[PDB]
Amino acid sequence: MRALLPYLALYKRHKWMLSLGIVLAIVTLLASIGLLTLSGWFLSASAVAGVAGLYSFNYMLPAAGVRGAAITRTAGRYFERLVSHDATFRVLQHLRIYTFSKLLPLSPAGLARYRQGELLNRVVADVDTLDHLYLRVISPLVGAFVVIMVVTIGLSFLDFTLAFTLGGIMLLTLFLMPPLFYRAGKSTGQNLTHLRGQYRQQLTAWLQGQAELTIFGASDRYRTQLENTEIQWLEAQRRQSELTALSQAIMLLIGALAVILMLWMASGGVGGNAQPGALIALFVFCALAAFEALAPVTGAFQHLGQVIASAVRISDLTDQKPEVTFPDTQTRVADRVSLTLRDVQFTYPEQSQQALKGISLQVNAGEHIAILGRTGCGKSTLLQQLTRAWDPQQGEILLNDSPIASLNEAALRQTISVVPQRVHLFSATLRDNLLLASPGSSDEALSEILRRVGLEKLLEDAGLNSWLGEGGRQLSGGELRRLAIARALLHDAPLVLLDEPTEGLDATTESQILELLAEMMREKTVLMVTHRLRGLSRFQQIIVMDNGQIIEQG
Amino acid sequence: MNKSRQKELTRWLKQQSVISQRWLNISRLLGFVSGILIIAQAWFMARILQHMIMENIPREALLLPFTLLVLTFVLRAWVVWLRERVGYHAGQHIRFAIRRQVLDRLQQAGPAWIQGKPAGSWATLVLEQIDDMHDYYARYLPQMALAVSVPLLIVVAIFPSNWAAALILLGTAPLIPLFMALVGMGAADANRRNFLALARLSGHFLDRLRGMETLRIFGRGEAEIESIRSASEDFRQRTMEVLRLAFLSSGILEFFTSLSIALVAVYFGFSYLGELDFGHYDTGVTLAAGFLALILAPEFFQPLRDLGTFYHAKAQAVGAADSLKTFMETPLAHPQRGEAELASTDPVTIEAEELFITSPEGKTLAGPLNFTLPAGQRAVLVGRSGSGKSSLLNALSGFLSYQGSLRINGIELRDLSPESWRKHLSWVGQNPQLPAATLRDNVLLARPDASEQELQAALDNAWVSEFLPLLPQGVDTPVGDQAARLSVGQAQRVAVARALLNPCSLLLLDEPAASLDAHSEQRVMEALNAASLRQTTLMVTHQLEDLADWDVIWVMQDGRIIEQGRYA
Ligand code: HEB
Ligand SMILES: Nc1ncnc2c1ncn2[C@@H]1O[C@H](COP(=O)(O)OP(=O)(O)OP(=O)(O)O)[C@@H](O)[C@H]1O
Ligand SMILES: Nc1ncnc2c1ncn2[C@@H]1O[C@H](COP(=O)(O)OP(=O)(O)O)[C@@H](O)[C@H]1O
Numbered sequence A: 001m002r003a004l005l006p007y008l009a010l011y012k013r014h015k016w017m018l019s020l021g022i023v024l025a026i027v028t029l030l031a032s033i034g035l036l037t038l039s040g041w042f043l044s045a046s047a048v049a050g051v052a053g054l055y056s057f058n059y060m061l062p063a064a065g066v067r068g069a070a071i072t073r074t075a076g077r078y079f080e081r082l083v084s085h086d087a088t089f090r091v092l093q094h095l096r097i098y099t100f101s102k103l104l105p106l107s108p109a110g111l112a113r114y115r116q117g118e119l120l121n122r123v124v125a126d127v128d129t130l131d132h133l134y135l136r137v138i139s140p141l142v143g144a145f146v147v148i149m150v151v152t153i154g155l156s157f158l159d160f161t162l163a164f165t166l167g168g169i170m171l172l173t174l175f176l177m178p179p180l181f182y183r184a185g186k187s188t189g190q191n192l193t194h195l196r197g198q199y200r201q202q203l204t205a206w207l208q209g210q211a212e213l214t215i216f217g218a219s220d221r222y223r224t225q226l227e228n229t230e231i232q233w234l235e236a237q238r239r240q241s242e243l244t245a246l247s248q249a250i251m252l253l254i255g256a257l258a259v260i261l262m263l264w265m266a267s268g269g270v271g272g273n274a275q276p277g278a279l280i281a282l283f284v285f286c287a288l289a290a291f292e293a294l295a296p297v298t299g300a301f302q303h304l305g306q307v308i309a310s311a312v313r314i315s316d317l318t319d320q321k322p323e324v325t326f327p328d329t330q331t332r333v334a335d336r337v338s339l340t341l342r343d344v345q346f347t348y349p350e351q352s353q354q355a356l357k358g359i360s361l362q363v364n365a366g367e368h369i370a371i372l373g374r375t376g377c378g379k380s381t382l383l384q385q386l387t388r389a390w391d392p393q394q395g396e397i398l399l400n401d402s403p404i405a406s407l408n409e410a411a412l413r414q415t416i417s418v419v420p421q422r423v424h425l426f427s428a429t430l431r432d433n434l435l436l437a438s439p440g441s442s443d444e445a446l447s448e449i450l451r452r453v454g455l456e457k458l459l460e461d462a463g464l465n466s467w468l469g470e471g472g473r474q475l476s477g478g479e480l481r482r483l484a485i486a487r488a489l490l491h492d493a494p495l496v497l498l499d500e501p502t503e504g505l506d507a508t509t510e511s512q513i514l515e516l517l518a519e520m521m522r523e524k525t526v527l528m529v530t531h532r533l534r535g536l537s538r539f540q541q542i543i544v545m546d547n548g549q550i551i552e553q554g
Numbered sequence B: 001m002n003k004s005r006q007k008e009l010t011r012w013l014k015q016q017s018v019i020s021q022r023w024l025n026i027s028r029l030l031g032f033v034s035g036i037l038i039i040a041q042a043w044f045m046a047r048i049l050q051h052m053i054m055e056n057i058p059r060e061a062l063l064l065p066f067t068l069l070v071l072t073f074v075l076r077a078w079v080v081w082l083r084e085r086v087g088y089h090a091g092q093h094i095r096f097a098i099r100r101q102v103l104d105r106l107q108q109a110g111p112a113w114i115q116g117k118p119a120g121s122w123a124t125l126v127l128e129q130i131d132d133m134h135d136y137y138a139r140y141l142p143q144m145a146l147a148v149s150v151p152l153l154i155v156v157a158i159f160p161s162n163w164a165a166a167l168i169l170l171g172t173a174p175l176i177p178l179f180m181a182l183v184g185m186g187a188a189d190a191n192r193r194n195f196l197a198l199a200r201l202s203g204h205f206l207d208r209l210r211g212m213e214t215l216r217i218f219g220r221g222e223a224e225i226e227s228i229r230s231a232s233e234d235f236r237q238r239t240m241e242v243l244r245l246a247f248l249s250s251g252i253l254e255f256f257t258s259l260s261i262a263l264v265a266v267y268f269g270f271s272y273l274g275e276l277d278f279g280h281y282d283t284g285v286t287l288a289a290g291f292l293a294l295i296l297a298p299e300f301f302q303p304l305r306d307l308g309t310f311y312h313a314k315a316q317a318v319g320a321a322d323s324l325k326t327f328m329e330t331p332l333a334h335p336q337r338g339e340a341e342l343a344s345t346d347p348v349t350i351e352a353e354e355l356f357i358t359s360p361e362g363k364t365l366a367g368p369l370n371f372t373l374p375a376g377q378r379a380v381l382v383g384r385s386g387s388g389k390s391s392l393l394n395a396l397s398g399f400l401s402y403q404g405s406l407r408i409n410g411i412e413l414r415d416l417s418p419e420s421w422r423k424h425l426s427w428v429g430q431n432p433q434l435p436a437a438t439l440r441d442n443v444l445l446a447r448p449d450a451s452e453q454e455l456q457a458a459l460d461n462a463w464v465s466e467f468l469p470l471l472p473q474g475v476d477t478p479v480g481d482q483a484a485r486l487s488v489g490q491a492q493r494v495a496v497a498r499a500l501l502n503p504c505s506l507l508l509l510d511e512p513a514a515s516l517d518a519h520s521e522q523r524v525m526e527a528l529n530a531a532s533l534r535q536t537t538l539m540v541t542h543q544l545e546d547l548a549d550w551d552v553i554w555v556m557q558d559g560r561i562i563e564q565g566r567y568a
């Protein structure tokens, strides 16, 4: 339970809103226990008095209590759900920011090993899970621990023995049942996630290899293996559903145990009175209604298991040391830059063969160089050291005959602007999708770039205000690439190194190099990398390289 | 919204329900049996309480009701234990059957259709979209059958005792749905006004988290936190207006479960005093008739309250139902399986006279084409990108249905048994995947029971043993995209080992040296040129400098071969 400490300091920030939902949770359960225990007493107080004692029985006050408790229960339940969700949503932004802030310095390096499609979908999944810690594990538990104390102290004014044995039964199960079930489903919950990832890994490798699992006749053998894991997986799910049924069947027996005991012992008498007329119904009905307070505790061991497992994943992911460090020298923005590489080597973590061996190339300022790698062979890996995502080992990177590690983060991002291999639409207005390049830029200047690069088609109908990404219209693969160069023009840098601009598109690939020399041809350096040998002759020092090493460079 | 679809979609779910109809009736029956025990509970407690409070009977004397009340508690906790086990078993057989129908329809549709969608989103449909259909069958339905049965037993059980208390509980029976619909016309308006925004603004954090690489290059790393805070400070105050009215639909259930207990307490409380003499059947209002109504007053609304929690599991099993229903309503075309045999393991003489290749979606791939090469002949295909030359390789394997006429050694391929036809086939794609757990189990994919000596012969032929020392565990190194990955130069040299291990009749090389390093290219070509002359082969490589010995060359540009002949 020590994994929750980093994610509990983000709740202490909103402790004065989180505690209002808990206090509202206490009231709406006391108002529901009080409504029914007063009803139970009032129902038996009048019956004992009978019609004879009608004029000698004050029913004005009990009739006000059932009216007061009815409004309190219905209003408190409504205001609980608002404040509880209001605080849940307010701590969510402190979890999205905390996860994003930690994951950002190590975004290229610390997230390399994982499948980015499933890893990021997982991270968002286990940020919501951590967000429900208060709403399912704290509020049900903390809100029910003090509700028991209030009724125990409240019933203590009538009989110490009856009040404590009911409170002792309630408090014992609150403090003992959640742990004995978290300690029982811990093994299954660990085994259930292992098989979920084992079934998903076998299924993905079965669908992807479906073309060659049928030719060689192994498509049915690997399906039996696939379904055997599902049989094991669906039995681990059954075991965790044999505890949900057991936890729900036990507190209906404990809630029973606290009803007979109130029926049985209170017959002997409450306080010193050996013949309790109506106070028998005050204790049995309190015990009958007070186990709805511990009702949300059921299943709070399942919800605690996922939350603690989710806290482990994020902690194991956002506590990695950054692979690269940026010293802060506050250097000025360099101009007319020119780098060089001398025997740059680099192997990825948990690898036994290098992806870059003996790379050495020298670039002058204002020179256009194309690196041609036929497939793999670290053409896109070489660009990562230049942007400084990984640190080369047994290698030297020099920029303007100075080490690249001397640049601070603000200056390094300024001097180097890259169009990535895969372009990202950020699901914002086309205006806000280009402000990434330049934080502050006049709209009129910004709108010129789109029509300059041949992207004026997007400006037809409120283009700069049109939504992009998933919500709006998706740019086509050829058209999306035309937007990356636009983001490389607003954020003008002395070194603008490209990365496969011509890949995947053919209708407008001819015009693509045109603006690559229409405005990138003046006082600029481009390390364009492609395997498409087309119109590359206009680039000096063309370099071909395979297996992670430069061979027969021009 | 989609009223036309939702009614139809909510009907497909019930057709899937028939798979586990035996348990969904036992779970419904136990809902009635658990209903009876609640009244059995409320009567024994009421009769015990009346005797003690009114007749002052000692507890030891009325021990028989005590030992009966305990028995119902044990017998009521038993059905609760039993209901959420039959409920799970009812929801598991649905998932097991659908997952088997989805996988079955995804296997005999061929690998031609699986390429249409990324394998991550196939695993998203088989993992999450079928597990989301659990709580609807396992929890929601066994609860909606408890919200219509159990509360009716209480009214049926108090009506003999007091018709006034029966109407108090029953008076809110029509009032609750009316008020939810009266507040639902405002909740569904705001939920429609914010429908555009929240859907557009919920996937904001993921998109920023998914594009961190693009977000740190341009230096916007510390400027997007101000855009995650501002897109989550709006998500709250925009969904706190949908919630503000969505929590009234539940407050007007806590309003009636409190008004109905206050009224039962006030009416019965005043009835004993002699104020309200209108409820009983002219036999006096006994105390036990009041406790029976008081204990059952919360139990009447308990089922309607719990159904509110599991109600989200209905749209979750519908939002995950349009993905599965439309999956099994696609008109995709099967490869027209048949039964036949090839007696001779010798190279087959494939031929055609008028042939068409069609996708499972129905789109045509290759136009009218025809070609013949006898046994032992080694053809080769060249063409422009998008000409459809791989389709012919992809349809000679049986993955693509053909409506023309392709013949294998004088036997029509349509009626040929695919399960036995592929035993005379070998296939090497341009981008081959490695489905086996380890490299040793990967070369031995055609014949797992191959002797270790036979395995060593294949490795040396495929030039994969040369880089074996580089890998840590030698030949048993696990292979994949997450543990000790091989380069495309090496991963291609183990797919070559697969094809040459078990002798075949027709070899379908599909650009073996398309994305391959210079050193591995000459190793694969030396292996695959000496392993193509001993049977009929069909190469589709695009580089054509070394075609001197390839006897026949077919070139196709728009789904049809234009000229066939030797390199000379
Ligand atoms: C559609 C609208 C809505 C929405 C949006 C939502 C959204 C949400 N949510 Fe909700 N809910 C609801 C409507 C709703 N909801 C309801 C109605 C209910 C019932 C009542 C109450 O609340 O209580 C609930 C309930 C609930 C709960 C508890 C349950 C019980 O009671 O048992 C929880 C925990 C939650 C969470 C949540 C979250 C996290 C979220 C985020 C996404 N939720
Ligand atoms: N299921 C499918 N698989 C492949 N192509 C398809 C499919 N459905 C339609 N097509 C279209 O039909 C054409 C068939 O040509 P295909 O790409 O299969 O052969 P190819 O040109 O040899 O492949 P490549 O371009 O990778 O060399 C493609 O251009 C593609 O756009
Ligand atoms: N995240 C990673 N982890 C480990 N190895 C990698 C990773 N990315 C690439 N590699 C290896 O490094 C080599 C260089 O790949 P790369 O040049 O990035 O591919 P591409 O040229 O298609 O962009 C590849 O052969 C690959 O096996």
Ligand SMILES: O=[P-]([O-])[O-]
Residues within 6 Å of the ligand: A374, A375, A376, A379, A380, A500, A503, A531
């Ligand atoms: O994978 P290639 O385009 O660098």
Ligand SMILES: [Mg+2]
Residues within 6 Å of the ligand: A379, A380, A381, A421
């Ligand atoms: Mg790349």
Ligand SMILES: [Mg+2]
Residues within 6 Å of the ligand: B388, B389, B390, B391
């Ligand atoms: Mg092809």
